[PDB]
Amino acid sequence: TATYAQALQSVPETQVSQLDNGLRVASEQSSQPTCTVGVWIDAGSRYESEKNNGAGYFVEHLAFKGTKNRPGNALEKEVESMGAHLNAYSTREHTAYYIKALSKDLPKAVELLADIVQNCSLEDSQIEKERDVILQELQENDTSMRDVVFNYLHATAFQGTPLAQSVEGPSENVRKLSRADLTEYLSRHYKAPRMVLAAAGGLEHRQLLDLAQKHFSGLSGTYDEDAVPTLSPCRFTGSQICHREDGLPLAHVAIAVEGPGWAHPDNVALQVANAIIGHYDCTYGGGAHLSSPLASIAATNKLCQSFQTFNICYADTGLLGAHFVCDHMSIDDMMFVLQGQWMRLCTSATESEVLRGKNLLRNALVSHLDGTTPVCEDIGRSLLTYGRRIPLAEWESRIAEVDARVVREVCSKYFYDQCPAVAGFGPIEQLPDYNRIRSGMFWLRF
Template structure:
């Protein structure tokens, strides 16, 4: 499996001043009532980050700067293929021995690949942390990558591709990346094309490991009942060797955003699936937070929702009252130096024209006329959703690993809360005017797309004045 959405919190200088003006007591509050995230860096660049909450269970994992963004058209799919091969046996454990060892200690071992990261993690009893780290180190460093296993896994990945092709939302977002980042690594899919999967060999996998799986590109993250010092000792034992030369590692190539569109017309489908996005910002950009709040203002809705006709959200009321769509959801996908900010919606051919126009009207409204009440409600909802997402050792561990890779530290929850609370309606409007208003969008659609407005009309709607239809 692989995940798409990630979130970040950074604040502008103006927001920092606003926070600082609240006084020393407020700043001191940031340091209390939250478990400390401890970080240690080994001489070879390998990092260990933990949050100890004194629980009987823990999650520990390796977060690696490796994904489809570090591939080319010729080897696209290698990172994901390698993730599959990690559980097929090592020089110390056969696949059966590995599976039995994990099962016998009641643990769970899993992995996923995204466009910029590959993750291997285990959830186990805290007392079994040393064994979990031993297993993780073994599958990363000693995988046999046997020819028979490679051939068997080709079929597994090809079947996975067939399943994803039946998920229209996944297809649309792959199309969106392909058109928004055409000609760049972010335009590649995570699984890769089928012709690559059929041709990837052991040498390709070994080469990718040597190029991307370097100590300075890894973070060993853990949450739950974990002793930081003991985990550091384990890291020294398993990952503390001398750093390999990093001269051969591929750097992060800039990925140019292109306003454009992909339409895959299939009149046999009952609904049109559309994603409309502008270029957002990367993890460390200070405009991330106001764009997150704007994202929350637009929100999400589907026909089965109890919220609708009487909800304060104007776009939601419009869709509920007029039945213009089956569902919609805003999204904010972040990468190191760029991102996609937009909305994904499902409708039918009879309503796709009006639905698109109404959605763009809402985008223009948020650019110019968003209210203080809407912003406060959006901030509260955002904070609630983020807190829910951090419920459990696995999401906390994931949060630690991702943040360590993206900007070198874990942002404490109180600091995150203060930064979000510092956002004003004017901050949201400024960000929307900068990144959404009069910008070239990327559009991807699949289904009966005949009535979807032409790209030139969609582009024109990105600067037309708000019509007041929601007033």
Template structure:
């Protein structure tokens, strides 16, 4: 494997309106953003999301659609961001161990009970959240809630199971390493947030997986699995009063977080580049991004419109150069990429907005030029018609993402953690409709124009442009 080269962003004397320094280090998030609470004024929607809260800060939110099935889950404000360098990977390790048996159920008993209910039990860990959820018949809601409470509060975390799970996680890491897109986005975070917890991977380094002990898992549970950091969300055939009673019964005794037990983990964005050259690979996998908006910023919606305008494309789609998307047409006409995908990733106090693409080594320079040229076009030249079209696509995507109780439940849980309320889809659509072309151009200009990008690239990257060249293309020179 070629060595990983991290080149810090070149120092520039200019001061920017949002990023105070362009030498790699930026000002604290509190100085960079003036975030307006997206959750300011609730409005009506067809199916109301009901919310309540227990005395220990535990929140309950549900949407009753009257279906015979439901999805219920725990959304926890805990992820790899809240780990130290020594314990990086413990949140994901804990997710694995949660299903290995409790003080009242063995692993086999747990699996049989879930299967006999005809239910589906699953979990995932991200950089800021850990989620455990069950999809079941509405009549089995209490059994599902009790199982979720049992596994998150009474897991045995046996030493023998911990030793066996190390090998499982190491094999999972090998599978992730074979997914080039996952690797590129891990690299992108590593260079964008270098020196901060947000730059670490979710799975953690292999040496940590081999050294994590039961005490590390117990400490993480005691610190982060507390009432005020949890949301019990449900969607489908769910009565909110009943769900609230179940929450009080099974989660009412959870303690609140101790003020000093969960320290804040601030972040810091660094414009930079990371490259892993592998000439034996057939294609180069690249991500180019800038610092975007955090969850609560109202700028987020305009950035979503901009990324929707760029969209995504893959050769397997079989489309020609007759698309309405100018960027896609140019990619296809010049055979510049195998695929591309615009993205807008948000966190509590920061975000990443950019594009991921796969291309041949001979087209790497031209693809970079095309991507950055369209980034600049978004800042000033995107037309009102294109903005309206992107807004319609975005609204369609949002509605399609709420297809099914699991998707709705996830939307509720994520919103409750990020905004402390569920943003109704009608309100989100109204916010999108209120945007004008000038609004989108102004927000994109703020976050993209003349800003320091981050780049992550793996594969045959011989033709990767120098960072100074990439940085200079983030503005247009006018005579």
């Protein structure tokens, strides 16, 4: 018959092995003809000072434009010709480079990744070409109201801390960053005990460890000692940023309290409550019959174009709340209906709705880990944030634990009577005054 609990046991164990220099090498072997290999670096914008805030993003732009062993076109041509896809990203805490390739092409994929990671030929003519490209991207990102509001939310919540900074950096830093600025960041940050070589697909683990000694060895000899860089905690501030712009058709609001951070066991319970509230979009079929009270009232009364809950995680901190996009006249109702939902759950959560939230999460977790790219991403990220790969059976075990009593206790710990960080953009005349938002963070009835 094969039950769901039984099926969680069936997924193979992530094999973790450490190299002599500090490079963690981890694999999840499956049956697939393809794979995803990558390097996950514990480096972002939180690691950057005010004077070098665009650095990680600048290196990301240069990482595929030529190495000492493969100049200019060479990397592109090699990856393209074997049918492989080469990708990268940088978040406030993590930088990643990964190849989607055939499993038989795993030797070459690992080799090419090593070249990008260690031997990036940061060519003077190229860093000058890249500055015009990043500047254009900044003008591009301005038009995305969503990207702006979340950047504002980090800026106001994490006021005067490394976390207030965006991944991209400011315009001043993009046009001023030197060749020496980027090599200094690279030497300080791209060090083996802060790197995970992750892989998922039709590969044996022994194959991967061989390749890591074959291509990543040569980051030892002597390392660290003089400059040990550990992250200092980031103070969250209850605050508001309001960018009034009546020329934009719809308002964007992101509201969040301080979350606990990656490691904390009660991230599971917060996520269940975030599932109960869920997310909405004007293209959803459900309408008035949707389970979630906020979603159902929002559809019925045409209260927005969309909303989404989030639990953004950082080391020892994070942002927990909702973002929505709505008409100028609908901001007040939307705040009220959302805040009332946080409070309902904080004081009076019920057994049934909590099981639904548990079920959405089980489904979210399993649907997410589908194919080599999501699993390889989960291997790299988890090794940086948890130290191990948390098996699906354990996630289920930690999900199954969460009753209504858990939800309202954990919700209260973070949501009840707390100062939110509020980010507003667009036609925001009807956006509530901070005091009133603060007032919606408690119930006089309770």
